[model samples]
Target: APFDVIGPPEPILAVVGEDAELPCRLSPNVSAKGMELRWFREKVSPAVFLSREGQEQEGEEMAEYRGRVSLVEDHIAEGSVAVRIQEVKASDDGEYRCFFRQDENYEEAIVHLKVAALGSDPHISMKVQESGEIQLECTSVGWYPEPQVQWQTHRGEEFPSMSESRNPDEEGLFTVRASVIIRDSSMKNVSCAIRNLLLGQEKEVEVSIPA
Candidate 1:
């Protein structure tokens, strides 16, 4: 196994617009300074990243990765290496191949990349019902998969009247609408959260009601 390339056992999760680093190493740990290292998706026609004979061949990369994909070759002579994708996008998600070749020997390892996004701020809209109940709706656009929309008082108590609806945009991203009717005007400040399960992150917005 002169060219045994090993990638991380766990998938790499990244936030959209941030950077992602996919690490790989050689087993039996040998110098890879003279090897050809490349990364690709389904095909190699447009490589994600490529380093040939110790030189980073930037021109061989795919158009999407042009100037954005780079190699981490500082430890190349010691066998540990990786490729970095700057400003990672949702489209960059899925499995990619980390390939290495040393003249007659070559090997590859699979690396999976997971991408998540935190979209626009939850916009709060308010309306007053004829019955004196205050109506509040939270709207947000451009989310990945589907997000959780929750309503709460500024005191952290959940709003039980909360109802949510979601729609998918042309790109398949999500748009969320969460509505709640407030009978207890005692709570002047209210808030809502847009939660991304994949990212384990959320965005929130608060609104002040007129007394």
Candidate 2:
């Protein structure tokens, strides 16, 4: 009998510009010394990682995946191994298939790489309106999935915005920008929150308007 291939016990909610480790291993715990291991994502047959009898090889790898893949070998003989993708990109989110073969026996498992990214801090700029009101805009760049943008006062009151937009470029990351006017002179310490749902995280910034 051959063996069973396993997926992550869990990017792995991968972040842009960060490393994403996709876990793939063998169950029933058998030695994997001479097994052929391959990793393909989304499109089958497009190899992102290739290991033949414990040696990593390439050149047949997809153009975007070359030089971006690695393997774990310390415990490989114990049937435990995984692959790491260096410098995770936004387009790296998808289902990855891990294939293992020994002689004529083979097995494949599915590992999901969920991509989530957070970008630079919110940048707020202020402009003077003709009516003595101040117009302020908050912008965040390179975030994924179009994070929630909010404007509020330090005391927990929400403010209406002049404009808000979450846009994606060719890379699929979002640029979130919003603006709000200070119609009330009493508004103090304007705050903005860039909330990322996938990461369950948020980046907050504040701009204090002075007389």
* Top TM-score prediction, candidate number: 2
**How does each model score on lDDT?**
0.85, 0.84
The TM-score obtained by model 1 is 0.78
- Count clashing residue pairs per candidate: 0, 0
As a TM-score, model 2 comes out at 0.84
What ranges in model 2 sit over 4 Å off? 128-134, 159-162, 169-172, 209-211
**Candidate 2 residue lDDT tens string, 124-195:** 999986978898889999888779888888899876777899889788999999988887778768999998
Candidate 1 C-alpha lDDT tens digits along 1-211: 5457898989998887789999899987888887889999989757999888778787888888888988887887789888999998778989999998887789989999988777798899999877778889899998885888877888898755368888877655789998888777588799988999988889999998876
Instruction: Please list all clashing residue pairs in model 2, or write none if there are none.
Output: none
